[PDB]
C-alpha cells in the first residue's frame, strides 16, 4: 500500500494546513458594511487616475475632482469604499493602515520601490495585516521587453518577500486617455471582488467608522456674538464598522487626529447605497455610488456654495420616577448592606409548612470543529433572542449594529478644526474602552526597527501610535538583570527587544504598537522613518526603576588584609549609616566596611580578604531610584493649518546643535590600549 | 480659542523639558560617584540600598 500510505500522509498534511485558530466575528450577516479599500502609494504614482478609472468602470459614471471616501456598490453583495491617502503625511498613512481592509499598494515600475511603500507595509504588518494587492504602474516607461520581464520578475520576488506570497500584483500597461486600459481594469475588479477577508482583533473589539460627510451646527447668531472663537457643534455622518456601538448617548470616542470627544446625540439613517437584496426585499416590502464631499453628477457641495459644472414589569422597573414600594404593589396589584433576606416568623412558617407538599415534586470531530461549534451556537442564540421583541432591543439594548447609516453630533469641536478642514484627509472615529480612557504608565517590550540607522535613547521623545490615538512620550528603557530587578539602560539593544516604560494613555495588554521619530514632512531626508516596534505587556500606575550608582574610594594605608579607605564618604555619620556593608575592589577581591575612622573624617577601615594594593579602587554598588517623566503630548495633527509639519519635541542631538553646545564627554572614560609588561616576582 | 490655549501651555512644558534634557545631570544620576564630586552628607539624608 505504498502510494495509498503516501497520499494518506499528503492528505493529513493538507488537513493540518487547512486548520487555523477559532475567532469570533462580531460582524453581521444581514447588512454587512462597505469593505474599505485604501489606495496607497508614493507621491506622483497615479492613485487619482486609477481611482477615476475604477469608479468609471464599476458604475458607468465618470468623474472629476475625486476627494474623500467614495463608496460604490460592487457585486451582488459587496460595497467597496475607495479612499486615497495622500502619502506625504505619515499620520494619514498611520490611521489608514489602522482602519483599512483592502489596500491597493500602488508602486512605480521604474523605481522598484520607495520608502513610502516600505513604511506603509511596516505599519500594516504591526497594527494588523490587511489584505494587500499590488499594482505596478508606470510600465510604459521601459524600452526593451527583455528588461521589462527582468524588472517585473525582480519586483515580484521582492514584493512576495514582504507580503504573504500569494498576493498577485497586477501590472498596468499605460495611460491611454487619462484612464487605464479597459481589459486590465476589468481584471483588477475581478480580483478585488473575488478576494476573501479575515477579521482582525482591533476591529473586533472596537466600534469604528470612517466619516463620510461633515457639517457644522452653530447659530451664526452665536458666531457673530462670540467672534469665531467658540467651540462648535459638529455633525458627522457615516457608516459604522466593527462592533455594536452602544446607543446610550453620552459615550466617548476618539476622532483620530483631533482629540477625545464625547457623543452628544446619535441617530440612525437609511443608507444612500443599498445592495440589491436590500433593494429587492425592502422596495417590494414597501410596494449606484455615494461620494458626498466629492463630485458626482456634476456638483460638489462646499461649506455652503454648491458648485455645478458647465451644464408591565419592564418599564415598571426602569421607570425611574417610581419608588420600588409601589412598583411591587402595582405589580401584585430595602437595605442591601445586610444579607439574610426578610422572612416571616418561625411559628407562622412552621405551621404553614407542617407538610412538604409544594416541594416533593421539586425533589427527586476534531477539537477545532468543537470550538467552532460552540461559537456558532452562541451567535445564533444572540440572533434569536433579539428576534423576541425586535423593536425595543434594536434601538436600545444593542446600540446600532455594524453597517447602518448614522449621524452623530459632538459638542465643542475646536474652531481650528472646522476652519482648516479639507476633504482630502480621512477622519475616523474609534469608540474607546473603559480602560483605554485611563492614564497610568505602560510597560512594553520594543526593539529598534531593523531598517533604521540610529539606536534610540532614554528620555528621548518617541512619537508612537497605540490604539487609536497617536501621541508623543518620553520612554525609559529597562533591562532585568537576569530577572531580578529592573535596571535602567540608556540605549536600545540594537538587535534585540528590551523593555520600555512610559506614561501615556493606557491600552489593553498584548497590544502591538509602532513608534516613529520625526513626523514633520519638512524633515525626513533619505533615511527611513519608523523607529521602534513593540508590544505592551502590563499596566500599572507606578513602577520603580533603578540606576546602579557605585561609590568609589581609594585605599591609603594597607596592612596585610586590612586597609583604610579614603574619599568614598564625607563624614563619620555617613560611614556609620553605611557600615558593615559589602565592598569589592576592581581586582575581584571582596571585603566589608567595618568601622569609621574618627581622626580624619572621611576614612574608614575595611577588611578585605586578600592583600589589596595601592593601585586599586574599591567600589560599592547601590541602586538609586529613577522615575518617569509625566509628559504627554497628543498629536493634534489636522487642527494645524499645514497638516504636515507638526513639530513636537526636539531631540538631544538637534538641540545641542541648535543652542550650539558640545557633547558632554569626560576624558578618563574613553578606553585606550593596554600593554602590561610581564611580571616576575622576586 | 482653547486649542491655542492648551498649545501655549504645552509650549511652556516643552521648554522646560528641553533645557532640562540638555543640562548637567544629577550627582546620583551619574555612576562612579566620588565624595568630592557630590554634595556633603546627601548620602546620609537620602535612601539607597
Amino acid at each position: 500500500p505504498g502510494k495509498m500510505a503516501r497520499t494518506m500522509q499528503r492528505s493529513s498534511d493538507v488537513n493540518e494546513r487547512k486548520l487555523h485558530v477559532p475567532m469570533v466575528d462580531r460582524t453581521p450577516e444581514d447588512d454587512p458594511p462597505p469593505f474599505i479599500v485604501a489606495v496607497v502609494g508614493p507621491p506622483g504614482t497615479g492613485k487619482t487616475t486609477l481611482i477615476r478609472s475604477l469608479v468609471r468602470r464599476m458604475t458607468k459614471s465618470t468623474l472629476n475632482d475625486i476627494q474623500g471616501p467614495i463608496t460604490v456598490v460592487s457585486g451582488k453583495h459587496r460595497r467597496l469604499t475607495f479612499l486615497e491617502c495622500p502619502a506625504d503625511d505619515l499620520n494619514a498613512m498611520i490611521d489608514i493602515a489602522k482602519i483599512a481592509d483592502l489596500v491597493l499598494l500602488l508602486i512605480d515600475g521604474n523605481f522598484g520601490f520607495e520608502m513610502e511603500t516600505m513604511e506603509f507595509l511596516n505599519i500594516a504588518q504591526h497594527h494588523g495585516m490587511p489584505r494587500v494587492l499590488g499594482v505596478a504602474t508606470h510600465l510604459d516607461l521601459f524600452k526593451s521587453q527583455s528588461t521589462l520581464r527582468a524588472s517585473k520578475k525582480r519586483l515580484k520576488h521582492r514584493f512576495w518577500t514582504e507580503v504573504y506570497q500569494g498576493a498577485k500584483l497586477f501590472y498596468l500597461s499605460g495611460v491611454i486617455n487619462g484612464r487605464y486600459p479597459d481589459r486590465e481594469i476589468l481584471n483588477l475588479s475581478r480580483f478585488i471582488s473575488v478576494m476573501k477577508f479575515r477579521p482582525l482583533k482591533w476591529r473586533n473589539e472596537h466600534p469604528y467608522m470612517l466619516a463620510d460627510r461633515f457639517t457644522d451646527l452653530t447659530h451664526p447668531e452665536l458666531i457673530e456674538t462670540q467672534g469665531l472663537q467658540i467651540d462648535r457643534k459638529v455633525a458627522i455622518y457615516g457608516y459604522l464598522h466593527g462592533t455594536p456601538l452602544p446607543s446610550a448617548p453620552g459615550t466617548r470616542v476618539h476622532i483620530a487626529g483631533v482629540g477625545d470627544f464625547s457623543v452628544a446625540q446619535i441617530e440612525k439613517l437609511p443608507d444612500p447605497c443599498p445592495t440589491p437584496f436590500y433593494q429587492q426585499k425592502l422596495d417590494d416590502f414597501e410596494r449606484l455610488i455615494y461620494a458626498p464631499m466629492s463630485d458626482v453628477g456634476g456638483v460638489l457641495m462646499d461649506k455652503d456654495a454648491v458648485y455645478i459644472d458647465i451644464g408591565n414589569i419592564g418599564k415598571l422597573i426602569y421607570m425611574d420616577n417610581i419608588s420600588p414600594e409601589e412598583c411591587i404593589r402595582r405589580w401584585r396589584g430595602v437595605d442591601l448592606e445586610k444579607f439574610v433576606p426578610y422572612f416571616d416568623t418561625f411559628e407562622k412558617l412552621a405551621k404553614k409548612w407542617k407538610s412538604v407538599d409544594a416541594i416533593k415534586e421539586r425533589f427527586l470531530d476534531t477539537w477545532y470543529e468543537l470550538q467552532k461549534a460552540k461559537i456558532s451556537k452562541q451567535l445564533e442564540i444572540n440572533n434569536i433572542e433579539y428576534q423576541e421583541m425586535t423593536p425595543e432591543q434594536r434601538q436600545r439594548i444593542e446600540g446600532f449594529k455594524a453597517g447602518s447609516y448614522v449621524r452623530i453630533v459632538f459638542e465643542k469641536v475646536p474652531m481650528e478644526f472646522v476652519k482648516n478642514f479639507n476633504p482630502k484627509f480621512p477622519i475616523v472615529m474609534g469608540g474607546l474602552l473603559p480602560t483605554e480612557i485611563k492614564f497610568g504608565i505602560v510597560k512594553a517590550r520594543l526593539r529598534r526597527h531593523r531598517w533604521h540607522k540610529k539606536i534610540l535613547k532614554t528620555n528621548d521623545p518617541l512619537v508612537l501610535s497605540l490604539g487609536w490615538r497617536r501621541f508623543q512620550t518620553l520612554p525609559i528603557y529597562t533591562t532585568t538583570d537576569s530577572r531580578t530587578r529592573t535596571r535602567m539602560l540608556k540605549y536600545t539593544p540594537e538587535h534585540t527587544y528590551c523593555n520600555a516604560a512610559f506614561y501615556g494613555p493606557l491600552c489593553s495588554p498584548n497590544t502591538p504598537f509602532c513608534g516613529v521619530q520625526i513626523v514633520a514632512n519638512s524633515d525626513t531626508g533619505n533615511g527611513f522613518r519608523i523607529a521602534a516596534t513593540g508590544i505592551v505587556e502590563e499596566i500599572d500606575v507606578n513602577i520603580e526603576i533603578v540606576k546602579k550608582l557605585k561609590l568609589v574610594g581609594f585605599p591609603y594605608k594597607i596592612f596585610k588584609n586590612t586597609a583604610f579607605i579614603k574619599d568614598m564618604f564625607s563624614s563619620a555619620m555617613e560611614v556609620a549609616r553605611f557600615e558593615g556593608a559589602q565592598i569589592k575592589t576592581v581586582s575581584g577581591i571582596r571585603g566589608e566596611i567595618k568601622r569609621a575612622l574618627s581622626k580624619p573624617e572621611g576614612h574608614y577601615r575595611a577588611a578585605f580578604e586578600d592583600k589589596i594594593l595601592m593601585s586599586d579602587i574599591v567600589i560599592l554598588r547601590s541602586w538609586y531610584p529613577v522615575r518617569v517623566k509625566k509628559f504627554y503630548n497628543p498629536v493634534t495633527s489636522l487642527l494645524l493649518k499645514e497638516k504636515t509639519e507638526w513639530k513636537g519635541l526636539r531631540l538631544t542631538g538637534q538641540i545641542r546643535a541648535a543652542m550650539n553646545l558640545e557633547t558632554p564627554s569626560n576624558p578618563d572614560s574613553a578606553y585606550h590600549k593596554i600593554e602590561r609588561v610581564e611580571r616576575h616576582f622576586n | 480659542s482653547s486649542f491655542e490655549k492648551q498649545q501655549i501651555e504645552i509650549r511652556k512644558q516643552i521648554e522646560q523639558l528641553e533645557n532640562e534634557a540638555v543640562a548637567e545631570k544629577k550627582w546620583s544620576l551619574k555612576g562612579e560617584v566620588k565624595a568630592k564630586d557630590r554634595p556633603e552628607d546627601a548620602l546620609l539624608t537620602e535612601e539607597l540600598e
Binding site: 555619620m573 549609616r577 | 552628607d41 546620609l44 539624608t45 535612601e47
Partner: peptide, 21 residues
C-alpha cells in the same frame, strides 16, 4: 567656636532629617 555652633546645628539638622525619614 561659633564654627562649633555651625557644626552642632549641622548635627541636629541631619539627625532631624534621618529620624524623620
Amino acid at each position: 567656636h561659633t564654627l562649633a555652633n555651625n557644626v552642632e546645628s549641622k548635627l541636629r539638622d541631619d539627625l532631624e532629617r534621618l529620624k524623620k525619614i
